[PDB]
Ligand binder design. Structure first.
Ligand SMILES: O=c1ccn([C@@H]2O[C@H](COP(=O)(O)OP(=O)(O)O[C@H]3O[C@H](CO)[C@@H](O)[C@H](O)[C@H]3O)[C@@H](O)[C@H]2O)c(=O)[nH]1
Ligand SMILES: O=c1ccn([C@@H]2O[C@H](COP(=O)(O)OP(=O)(O)O[C@H]3O[C@H](CO)[C@@H](O)[C@H](O)[C@H]3O)[C@@H](O)[C@H]2O)c(=O)[nH]1
Lengths: 456, 447
């Protein structure tokens, strides 16, 4: 009996790939202990966890209760759990060592590598990180101590050239701004965590050769960093049935059934809102001006804090009236089944902030992407898609809040992506490779067996 | 040799519309009409309607009545500011009217201007009248108010105002405009000064007819409201005219109505202007989606009013439209898809609903609207809820609103009565109808 322990970080962007990896390991007949930091931050995490545990009642949920963290750096509830874990991870050792059956391996989130590395070494089992973003973004993370020691860093630097990765030249404009400030916490965490990769037994990435061939080969051939552990491309993590909410109104699917094939552009900027009010108006104005059918999924401005503000409060009355007249667009404020949407033949395009889970899903369903990266890794992820030729993004729009992107710019970008058959044909090729990756003898099965060979 | 009539409307679409429709009726009787236009006109809606009217009837002489701007200490209401200017600059009219060819035969001015215009009309020496733009029952209340004010029970003790023989026999205290219950109010003083001046007119024109206000028309002309009141001419219904149609209007509203089952749409409009708070408007949208009926909601310009679930149902279910524009209300009320009218019960909308046989869910907000709503309810082609209160008194919730909408839309007794009111409205404008008879009686003394 192979026993694997899993510890995701906070946020749907981390919990979703971890529960999909858990599903993959259960199919390989592993016994899975899912470590759950408590109290969980968001309701969406609560609901997905209960839906997951219901679908797989054989998995053992180990509750990891966290004392309250009071930090002067940030009040964000997601950051405060992260602060709790790296100050109170000593509590995990008794819960993990005194555990039956004996653990065979430990897989935790890459963001928790500093607190969890001594915990894993005290358990004496093969331990790994699951990185929830692209292999190209991981290459940047692994290369960062080398990059920060250059005299070009930070002012002179124009392009970051990491040997052999899928994005050969990363401009300074695509680097997350805090990583250019040696005084930022982000910079400090990268400089502390990246050298610890050598202590790991391996790195798991939700990616496949069909989208990141160069980055995966560069990471595994000692090209990016000397002494890196093996990097396992175990993607794509395909959506699972337990994610689907049990009782949905079906009205979104019923609306998609009434549109022509490839007619609808789907817009989602991620699990949470990272976009200001003035920019959100311009988004709705751009969708109406584009002339294309659209399904725009918006989130609550603050997580789990609903408001009575109308859609004309956000977008303005005339924009809303023109929308209901032309009959071409839906705007919903809810947690949708994004896989049901991307898998529908009426959807011909995806306006995405390029969070990596949404990028892999679009690859799985062969939907071309109009990238609107906002923060963090998203500009690097968007260029991974652009390099593959199944997506496009406007590098001049900037990080979120740098400038106001007008509705006419947005409409012209939408019309560009929705009319480009070259992007659609390349996305269909990416989809074919994504389907091959999870077939029998495909890259995902090969990579999983290579992991399972050590465990037992 | 021609009969010449001068018309002076007060500010607002609720006053210009009946006056221009009266002008159309008078032009059909071969009168030469002079339209006195207070300038600058307050709203753009009045501008565009006036130009469409003059363009349709180029034989009408427009006399511009230039007014000095009232001061900021007078009011923030642009319609009261025109009132204040007219009261002080009415002396200007006497030169313009006495030096007018062909000489004037009669003079019809808005009732709200009866105080500054009465001495002007008497110097002209022609028969002069008021056009009251609201219901005959509301007029009976206005004419009876000096009698009511000199009562012992006025104002605190009174529970019901009983005007002898009118269409609504007992007007509850809760239906009286609140300022008229305050003997120190400005509204009170204007009522007390203007009402006795009615006895100095040659007659009163009301946009009404026997089909909707038989009792109060009888009581007014029978001396039962005020002894020696001049004759009251029921010259309604004022029907929509062609010049009101905007020549190049979109068809999104009509095309949407053409796709709905007959009698399935609730039309919702609270009048010519905004008169409802935002948190209340948010409940109107919730009530429309909760009612389950198709709706056409017209909103007037003054956090959002259009909730997310409301917009979703309009796009997925195609259940509703919400517009913020000057719609063609007559085209909407005349469409067979429309089966109900949620109205603030401004009198022109009431008469139009009667003209098209559309039952009314009354939601009175200010002034005469509770009295008008009961005129409809007494006729049996409408319903209103007394407990909702004046605008802003309390928050009427969406579930209350949805319940009232489902009541009116399902009530065939109201629809059949509205069809009967419509048949009387059509009869009133036919040969030998009450409108013709009242117009000939009104014009017999004009030379
Ligand atoms: O209405 C919704 C919204 C989201 N999802 C799902 O939720 C996941 C969202 O994940 P992702 O696309 O990564 O968005 P975020 O979670 O916002 O992305 C965060 O996490 C990513 C992975 O670490 C990073 O790449 C991003 O920069 C970071 O913002 C996806 O699987 C979606 O299918 C839904 O099912 N319905
Ligand atoms: O979008 C619109 C709105 C209104 N109308 C027309 O404008 C007129 C509105 O007149 P009315 O129904 O009287 O509304 P208001 O002008 O708001 O009513 C005011 O004036 C009335 C007549 O004096 C009074 O009875 C009311 O209490 C007072 O609020 C009607 O003919 C409607 O057909 C349109 O054509 N389109």
């Amino acid at each position: 009996v192979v026993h694997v322990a899993l510890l995701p970080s906070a946020g749907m962007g981390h919990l979703t790939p971890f529960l999909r990896l858990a599903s993959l390991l259960l199919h390989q007949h592993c016994h899975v202990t899912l470590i759950t930091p408590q109290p969980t931050v968001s309701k969406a995490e609560e609901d997905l966890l209960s839906r997951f545990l219901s679908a797989f009642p054989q998995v053992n949920q180990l509750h990891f209760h966290l004392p309250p963290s009071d930090s002067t750096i940030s009040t964000d509830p997601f950051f405060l759990q992260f602060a709790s874990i790296r100050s109170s991870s000593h509590l995990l050792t008794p819960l993990l060592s005194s555990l039956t059956p004996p653990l065979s391996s430990f897989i935790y989130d890459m963001t928790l590598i500093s607190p969890l590395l001594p915990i894993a070494e005290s358990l004496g089992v093969p331990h790994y990180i699951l990185f929830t973003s692209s292999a190209t973004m991981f290459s940047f993370f692994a290369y960062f101590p080398t990059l920060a020691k250059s005299e070009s860093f930070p002012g002179k630097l124009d392009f970051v050239e990491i040997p052999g990765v899928s994005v050969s030249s990363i401009p300074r404009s695509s680097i997350p701004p805090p990583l250019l400030d040696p005084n930022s916490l982000f910079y400090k965490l990268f400089m502390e965590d990246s050298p610890k990769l050598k202590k790991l037994h391996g790195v798991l990435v939700n990616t496949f050769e069909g989208i990141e061939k160069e980055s995966l080969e560069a990471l595994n051939g000692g090209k990016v960093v000397k002494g890196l552990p093996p990097v396992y491309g175990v993607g794509p993590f395909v959506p699972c049935e337990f994610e689907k909410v049990v009782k949905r109104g079906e009205t979104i699917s019923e609306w998609l059934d009434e549109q022509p094939s490839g007619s609808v552009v789907y817009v989602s900027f991620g699990s949470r809102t990272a976009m200001g009010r003035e920019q959100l108006r311009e988004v709705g104005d751009g969708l109406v001006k584009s002339g294309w059918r659209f399904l725009w999924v918006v989130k609550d401005k603050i997580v789990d804090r609903a408001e009575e503000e109308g859609l004309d409060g956000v977008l303005g009355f005339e924009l809303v009236e023109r929308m209901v007249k032309e009959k071409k667009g839906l705007v919903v404020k809810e947690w949708v089944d994004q896989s049901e949407i991307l898998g529908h033949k009426a959807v011909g395009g995806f306006v995405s902030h390029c969070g990596w889970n949404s990028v892999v899903e679009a690859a799985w369903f062969g939907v071309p992407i109009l990238g609107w990266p906002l923060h963090g890794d998203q500009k690097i992820n968007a260029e991974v898609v652009a390099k593959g030729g199944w997506g496009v993004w406007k590098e001049g729009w900037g990080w979120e809040g740098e400038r106001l992107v007008k509705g006419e710019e947005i409409a012209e970008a939408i019309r560009e992506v929705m009319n480009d058959e070259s992007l659609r044909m390349k996305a269909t090729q990416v989809k074919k490779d994504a389907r091959k990756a999870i077939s029998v003898g495909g890259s995902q099965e090969v990579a999983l067996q290579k992991l399972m060979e050590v465990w037992k």
